[PDB]
Ligand binder design. Sequence first.
Ligand SMILES: Oc1ccc([C@@H]2Oc3ccc(O)cc3[C@@H]3CC(F)(F)C[C@@H]32)cc1
Ligand SMILES: Oc1ccc([C@@H]2Oc3ccc(O)cc3[C@@H]3CC(F)(F)C[C@@H]32)cc1
Lengths: 221, 224
Amino acid sequence: DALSPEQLVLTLLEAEPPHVLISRPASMMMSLTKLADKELVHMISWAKKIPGFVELSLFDQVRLLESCWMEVLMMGLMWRSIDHPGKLIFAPDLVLDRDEGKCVEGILEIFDMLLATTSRFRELKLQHKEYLCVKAMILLNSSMYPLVSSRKLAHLLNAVTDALVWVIAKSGISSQQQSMRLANLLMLLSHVRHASNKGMEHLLNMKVPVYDLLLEMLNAH
Amino acid sequence: LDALSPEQLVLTLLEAEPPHVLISRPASMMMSLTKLADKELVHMISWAKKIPGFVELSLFDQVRLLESCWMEVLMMGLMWRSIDHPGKLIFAPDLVLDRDEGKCVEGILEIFDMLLATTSRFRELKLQHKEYLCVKAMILLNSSMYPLVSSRKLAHLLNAVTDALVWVIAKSGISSQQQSMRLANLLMLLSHVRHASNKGMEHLLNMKVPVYDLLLEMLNAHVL
Ligand SMILES: Oc1ccc([C@@H]2Oc3ccc(O)cc3[C@@H]3CC(F)(F)C[C@@H]32)cc1
Ligand SMILES: Oc1ccc([C@@H]2Oc3ccc(O)cc3[C@@H]3CC(F)(F)C[C@@H]32)cc1
């Protein structure tokens, strides 16, 4: 019942992470990095509140968290930036516009992928309910391996899909359009995965250790 | 309009399928894969040009899509011809590799595992021949965001191929909830194809045949 469409969406609503303030006393990358570390903590809490997630093997839980985190953060970023072209609302005291991305090399390229994907969600008029479904799906779909408890993950992923399909249905649009909107949303996931891969590569080409800090949190989990 | 109809479209993509590519071998594993990719790219252009309406996009978009997708389309091809043989990758008729051979070159094993794992999901879903034809066109048409944010034309084309896939899934006979679930399951896999594509690109650029520059030459010739 907790995985019933309407109930599931309300449950994901309440599970939303709080606002994160970095509280600033290289530096741009310092801030982004301090932010990620803080957001990751709340991201774990968020996942655990997704009905059934805690019931997957701890193996799958850790697996999913480890490979999704960057995507989920960027999905979050895109959603709070969605109404402001040219800008990225990373956090309540960290708003960066595109050009601030020229400072650090390699980043401008990523800002442009994030801004372009956000632009696309804006054009589709992504709803609050749809966004809650898509973000859970990003988590649940982040890793193939735990799927090829696997029974449980597949069932959970189907449940969230049903909820997204349900959300699209009460849209009142025709059945052809419903299929098209589902397809348009899911194809955007490719692009969120893409920006995620670019941001990971760049983070690792860098000389705060988010990834190791994440692994500590995961061992804590 | 009618040439983009679900039935005609699937048949048109069928005929547009690239030929078998023989690498014809007289570092080495990576030499082979690289010489193969280069040969496949030529035919991939031809393939794209046969997708109804592709040629009627701006040359700028045609080049954007081709440059962004090529690795994904290649890997989509790989997964499809490997789909019935777990543990193996049929790259080409004289180049079959199994997981283990991926240990030789460093970094490659991880990619093989992503490819093999994605191929296994396509096998579990029982990907159909005409579903595969639709998905691979979608991979091309959805490879780059920028050309969409002639943009009217690309969105129309992307909708036509999607309609065709939805149509393919419909005549499957299954219920309406399952049709939605199948569409969703297929498209979520695109994320994993994109992913393997990104790992394979990164690995290719960390290397010391120049596939990407050779692609840009082909792209300039396509342009001239
Ligand atoms: O809510 C958040 C969402 C995403 C992030 C990431 O932060 C870093 C940090 C170091 C690094 O090298 C790459 C990145 C990537 C790429 C990006 F576009 F700059 C932002 C990404 C952080 C918080
Ligand atoms: O049909 C084909 C499909 C994909 C390819 C690619 O070939 C190279 C070549 C050099 C390199 O550094 C990376 C890769 C990636 C990664 C991979 F898994 F090894 C195979 C990929 C080639 C032909």
